[PDB]
Amino acid sequence: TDLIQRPRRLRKSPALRAMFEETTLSLNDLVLPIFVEEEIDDYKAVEAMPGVMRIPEKHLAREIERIANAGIRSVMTFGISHHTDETGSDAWREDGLVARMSRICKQTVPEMIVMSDTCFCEYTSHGHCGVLCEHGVDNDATLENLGKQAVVAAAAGADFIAPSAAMDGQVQAIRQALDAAGFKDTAIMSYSTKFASSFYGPFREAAGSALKGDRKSYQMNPMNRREAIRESLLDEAQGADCLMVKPAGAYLDIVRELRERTELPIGAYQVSGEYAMIKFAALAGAIDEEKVVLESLGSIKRAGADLIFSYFALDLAEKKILR
Amino acid sequence: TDLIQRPRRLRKSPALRAMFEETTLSLNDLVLPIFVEEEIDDYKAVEAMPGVMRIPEKHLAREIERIANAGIRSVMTFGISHHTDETGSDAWREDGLVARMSRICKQTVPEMIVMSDTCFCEYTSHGHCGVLCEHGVDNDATLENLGKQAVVAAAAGADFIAPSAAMDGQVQAIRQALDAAGFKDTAIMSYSTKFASSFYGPFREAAGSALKGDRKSYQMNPMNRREAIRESLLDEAQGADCLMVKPAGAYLDIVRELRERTELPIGAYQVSGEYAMIKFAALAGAIDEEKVVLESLGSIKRAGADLIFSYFALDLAEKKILR
Amino acid sequence: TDLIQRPRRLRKSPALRAMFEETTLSLNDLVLPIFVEEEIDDYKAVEAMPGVMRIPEKHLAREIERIANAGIRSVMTFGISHHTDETGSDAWREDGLVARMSRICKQTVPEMIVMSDTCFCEYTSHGHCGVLCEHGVDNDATLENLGKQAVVAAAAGADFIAPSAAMDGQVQAIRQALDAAGFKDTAIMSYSTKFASSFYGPFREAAGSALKGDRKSYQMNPMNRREAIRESLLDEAQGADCLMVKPAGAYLDIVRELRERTELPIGAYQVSGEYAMIKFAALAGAIDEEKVVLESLGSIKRAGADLIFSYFALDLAEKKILR
Amino acid sequence: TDLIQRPRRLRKSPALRAMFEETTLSLNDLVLPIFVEEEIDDYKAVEAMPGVMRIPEKHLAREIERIANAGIRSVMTFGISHHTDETGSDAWREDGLVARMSRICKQTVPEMIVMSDTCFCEYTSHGHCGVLCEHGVDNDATLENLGKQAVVAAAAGADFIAPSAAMDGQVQAIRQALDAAGFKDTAIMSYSTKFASSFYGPFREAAGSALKGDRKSYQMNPMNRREAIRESLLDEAQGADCLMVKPAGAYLDIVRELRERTELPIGAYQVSGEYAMIKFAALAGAIDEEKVVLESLGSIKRAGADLIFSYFALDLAEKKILR
Amino acid sequence: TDLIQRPRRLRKSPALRAMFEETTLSLNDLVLPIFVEEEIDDYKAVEAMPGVMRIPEKHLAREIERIANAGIRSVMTFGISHHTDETGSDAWREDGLVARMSRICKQTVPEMIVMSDTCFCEYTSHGHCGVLCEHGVDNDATLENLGKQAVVAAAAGADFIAPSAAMDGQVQAIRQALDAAGFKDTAIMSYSTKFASSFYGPFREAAGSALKGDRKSYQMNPMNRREAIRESLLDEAQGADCLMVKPAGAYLDIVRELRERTELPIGAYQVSGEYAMIKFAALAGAIDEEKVVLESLGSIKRAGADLIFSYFALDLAEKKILR
Amino acid sequence: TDLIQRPRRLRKSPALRAMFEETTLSLNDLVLPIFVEEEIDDYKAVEAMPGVMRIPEKHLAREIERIANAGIRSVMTFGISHHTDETGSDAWREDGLVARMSRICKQTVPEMIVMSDTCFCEYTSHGHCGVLCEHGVDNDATLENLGKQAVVAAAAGADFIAPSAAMDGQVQAIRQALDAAGFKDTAIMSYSTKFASSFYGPFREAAGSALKGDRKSYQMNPMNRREAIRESLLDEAQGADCLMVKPAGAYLDIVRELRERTELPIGAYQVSGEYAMIKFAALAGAIDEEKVVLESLGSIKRAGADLIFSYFALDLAEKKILR
């Protein structure tokens, strides 16, 4: 044939595939979500998430030095509560689990970037992401409490307040409460586009949320691409330092669309259900885990994300697979 | 709080979420890939692809009829050969397996659109997608061969010749070859953007391809978003009736970018490893299969895919999940 | 002050600046240009290019091995001839210097991607980039010549034929010439947008080009941004596997504009005068070389360059500044 | 050959290269940054910047007539202080060096356009661009003082207040302070995109800033193209009359990107390190200075800049190289 | 009033308006159209074009030298024939007027770029731009003719063949004709978008064209903006080195639209009637000629014109209004 | 030739040129600017504007019935004053000339659309467009008076208040004053992009402005295309019902650019100098007036304007040339 065009020319060797590799993933792209249970003495393995386990609070300090030492520069704290009420009030206690989780990390490793998952689904009796009613999760009652929380997390050392509630106006809510209290420099990692997703399967088992029902009156419809972009652009207008798409894996078209519609940094969360799907298929021997893990993360980065939340971060770090 | 904008108003109930749902998935969207093994007696199920079976050519007509009753409009044919040589010429025999899968399918169900997987990886002794040489798979030697195959497939009744050899110029070669042979009406479903992906883990086992090494000198690098697009657009310029992104699951960005760069129909292949990841996590209790299968497939649709090749298609069809 | 937006939040620490850094430079990005002088005995260092040396063909294999050990993937070959005639035919000899630099390089290190600088300025008696006539450098006489050269280079093992004669139609002529000679697999790295720039000051000395006057009737005007783009796009239409902007340093706008006008890989050449400016100011104590070299190269990358031809590549490599 | 397209057609002669020159640089594009030291009797040559020297205040008046007479229509005043405190308070003194520098210029040459570099790095004990703390340079404490300064500079005759601090909200800060005090017509030349650059080498030697450390908690990361555009678009929203990219030379992709994202005029600063790199390479004989200077300035203009700050402005003016 | 934005700040003085002026006009931008009448003795001034004169071929070399001394780089040649037949073959004679105007010009001033007006309206007995038939001006009969003319012009020394017959396919025909004749280096300045405009009022008198009726079956309708663009883009596809909009004055929209639809140079012709309107109103005291001429020409430049054909060029040049 | 493309096909006949005419001009596009002198008994012909004359106020009523009867549906009133003070205060008198001019028109022809040129250049001693100072025309002092005027014009029946002062914030100024006084429905025809143009020659003679100097500290630079768009987009933000480009003729690139940047209606003013240039060239016999007038107006409409101010409107109307 007479093809002047031969794409295959640059795939002839490993050296050549390397010179022309358009995307590259490194360790500075990963944020390690960490699970921390108060009032427990020994490590609890999560079943649905092969290799992940709850860090007993009394060990938080040791592990976050371990995390820090393998090179992970950021963490997203999730707490498993033992003091859950109707409003989820522990979460905005001067020394609630939320605050302690932050304080212990920044104390133990000063330069470590601490993001605090700011919500109520793990601290509420009902397990919904906020204040519940004769109508459902009340949006504005939840914003007042998201603000109350933000300030104690900020106050306890988190570099980022990550509103995880999917409440309208949560970012603006949190910006003002943080400012008013003298926390003008504390940033917001907005879970801006957070879907009511079936990929969160393993997560209520991992961080013990006590909700039996669903979050579809606040977390958005997986199928709504226009609305997902709109969700994120509203948080930009409310001052978010960073936007986010969760889940990430089945929403890379969403991450790309958004990367072209804002100059802001974009995070993508590779959720428990994605980790679970990788882990359980490698066990059955169906796929090569390291291969599928690097390709998975790389696809996220290719779609446009600046930071990726992944539960594989530490192990990729330590086995020194990502430098 | 004075939020004028409140995304949650349209999420209040199931009726409102349905009124406003942006993307809807149907069975008209699904193409079912089928594996037929010649010269065997009973169905041989695939290990890494739980619930998937290798059909014995002797039941293929019983089967095409069952798929047809299910509501399914299209199938993609993949053959497991017993007559594998160095060039894989069972593929281009007037009566090779390839030609027999189409004629059986087309003969049993004349309404069925049969898409013929056009390659050599399952028919060569060495497992590569074509002619091997002292330097690698020869592009142009394989092109002449793909042509011979396409014409035997057309003549056997296949409505779509789908080149999966990831060879440069394949659409052009197949297009000429088909016109020259009086099949100017036979369409081409190009696997235009075909990545050298690790999500094909369970396919060497499912398809029975002999290959030991890698397909990186022809199948393209996962990280190259710009190249991905170039690949498909070169195929549009070559006359492909339909373009395709494969794998699809971790390439939703690619799907969306390409939807915006062409007016042509786009197919998306939810590959074997994707099928396996959902099965095993489901088996291991970590996720709700129905909810993940539906969400994964609809995501592919939301990103711009016109047609989605899925192994869950019959099951979704018969259980009447998608109409 | 009530600033909702505060860019500084993500600049507070080294850890945050790294999390959020948009562009990262690596050694995979660098191509090392090498000068080999035939018929000489010891290395002859270049005066205007402090630390750069003319390699004696008799050590080229010792050297390609050293570069190779450094981590370097690619080199661009420039030859200093002793056999210079009016058409510069040492360039198109089956055994000319051009063909010997490739074969030595390719023979010593078969993994090395050797890019062959394809021109006549270092091989003609008069120093021009081709055939001279009663009116100037003849475009089409030089095209036939570039073709002969490309084929001897391919046959010597060069993986890339890089036409630097700034002649109209060169990619097409070289592409045909290479296909006709059974090198349909040999790629073309076109110096597509090649400016008649004063940053090449130290190159007549480094390369030993005989030219006394100017190269303005073929190399293009620095001020023409629209022409710059036209130049490269004409080369994409002619089949170049890769495009290039040269010089790169003072043409970062050109790099960005072109990144937005093509999906093809783009190279950027940090020319001799750029190398010299950084050396001498560094020597004269005015700047920190490491910090300026790294920032200059990353800037090239930030603007859209896929590959950057730099004389600092080995030094950056061995001192292990870039991995 | 059969090329209908021959770009070379318009490069046949100097007359032709001229008719078709797309960009043109003149003297009205240059702003001359001038150095003025109080309490000194004789001119101080800067070492790192060959040909530049501090103007003793007692001579300011003579030189600015000289500047004005060669045709330079604008100046950017930089002061070398002898009264540096912790807050850098001299800079907002009714008759600080800042005010005197302006007053003396507008008095001496009424129609001369005076821009006043508004910052504190030259007037502070520590040499940081503002009010320093137990946390670092305090952003809002610095804005109150940037405003205080602006008003005395305005009051003393500067046509432009050029905030050089890289403090968030500095432009809005300065707009209000200027308005409130009756300086509604005094314009702001915002250093909107000002990187923490290694090209500023020679500058702490030239304007005596007493900082030992770096400005990376406020001046932005050289590698962040999206953020650089964002920085500039915020100052547009805050009322800046003019935007700016500093440094300019290795950031022409940035100047271009920005020229396409706003209708505002854009300045580009060719910093001390760029001047130094040109000057020291010409001395070593590596490049032709006039050639590299005009091409350097021309590239800046080509990228999209309306005004260029260059230390070569006066000498190009006088040697009558730019009219 | 609290206007943050105040456009007037940069209009306060002549110095500021000059600093910020977006478009600057020069003599390098001007092409001077010249009318040479063969077989006559003294200059014959044109009535409707006050100050414009028909040059007697016997002084053309005295004149080309005067224009040349003025600073003028280019001229467009228009001939007033005494040998007018039905096909206008004095135009394609080895020694016709057309060929003599170029050779005289090129012989007297070899630096001069001579653009040859390529048509038949001044050479045919009936005044039409080509061959007349029982149905109108024959497109293809005129194409063969334009070809013969272009080759005699090239051979006479003209650097630009400018087809003004408004015939379909003219660039292609002239391009082939010129290449075939070994003038692959002769450029083409196409009057690409040439309107059937009433601003040519004074040209039948100035050029001495015999036509009585209209040129609407070939010259295009003034109101068709979309067609205007199609016209020029078809000429870019045909290889024109330069495109043109004519008339220019009342087509500034066309100029801007086309600048945005091509990267090619664009010429703009300020036609005779435009020249006349400015003269007579000036004579009748209604306007200041210098100020209207300068503003009109700069407007053409602001709209995107690279080159402007103006009858005021020598006058502006000698009086030294534009340098 | 083999051109599949023949643009000439649709220009074969007058019927065909008509079916395919892209733009069309009718009478509903014209606004007739009318001149009205108070305290005079007989009509005053303007010299610089052949055919235009001042309407003595005592006849306004008769002529506006005449205007109305030929079909002109809108007028722009300009007054020649006999009571000119320093602030131009007559213009905001309950019964100033401004008010009377409006009142008399709406009284005499109710459905006639009356636009009131809102400025002070005809009512001031100095003739500048507002309040003059030790600094020049004071911007905000003028806005207070533009508002005062607006309300009496509104109050006296004008459908449009057309701020002609080129004062920053004039549209917002006028919106509020009109609202506050209960004139929420009175529209603003903003002279949004009004250049300091040399085409206004005949106008100070036509409406007796007593200014000797120029308006370049407020009317914008003819050469600033970016700024012209910016000027107009600010008036959109301030509530203008309609935008405008004046002059129109040499600024059609500006009208086009703007038509693509807003959804608002756009007016274009064919100024006195344009009329003058048409009129005086037709007298000399250089052009056909009706031809050049219709092509002139048509070009304006083609560039994108919705309404055109033309002094030829009445005569085109009456001679029934435009229906």
Ligand SMILES: *[C@H](CCCCCC(=O)O)CCC(=O)O
């Ligand atoms: C949201 C929990 C935060 C995101 C965790 C993502 C993951 O699955 O790893 C609500 C989750 C729920 O349905 O309980």
Ligand SMILES: *[C@H](CCCCCC(=O)O)CCC(=O)O
């Ligand atoms: C390509 C075979 C078609 C795609 C795989 C279908 C799937 O469900 O995985 C090459 C497969 C290979 O690498 O052998």
Ligand SMILES: *[C@H](CCCCCC(=O)O)CCC(=O)O
């Ligand atoms: C082109 C030679 C290749 C580019 C120069 C490489 C460098 O580092 O300067 C012509 C050079 C010349 O003008 O002789």
Ligand SMILES: *[C@H](CCCCCC(=O)O)CCC(=O)O
């Ligand atoms: C910013 C100083 C103003 C810009 C001067 C640019 C130049 O280098 O000429 C801080 C510079 C520092 O690091 O001291």
Ligand SMILES: *[C@H](CCCCCC(=O)O)CCC(=O)O
């Ligand atoms: C075209 C002649 C070239 C354009 C006119 C130049 C001018 O200044 O008017 C045809 C002219 C005609 O209609 O005869």
Ligand SMILES: *[C@H](CCCCCC(=O)O)CCC(=O)O
């Ligand atoms: C602005 C007067 C209103 C526009 C009239 C346009 C025309 O010329 O017909 C100031 C004009 C001046 O310079 O006096």
Ligand SMILES: [Mg+2]
């Ligand atoms: Mg939201």
Ligand SMILES: [Mg+2]
């Ligand atoms: Mg392909």
Ligand SMILES: [Mg+2]
């Ligand atoms: Mg070229």
Ligand SMILES: [Mg+2]
């Ligand atoms: Mg800023």
Ligand SMILES: [Mg+2]
């Ligand atoms: Mg045409």
Ligand SMILES: [Mg+2]
């Ligand atoms: Mg305005």
Ligand SMILES: [Zn+2]
């Ligand atoms: Zn929650």
Ligand SMILES: [Zn+2]
């Ligand atoms: Zn295959």
Ligand SMILES: [Zn+2]
């Ligand atoms: Zn060369």
Ligand SMILES: [Zn+2]
């Ligand atoms: Zn500073």
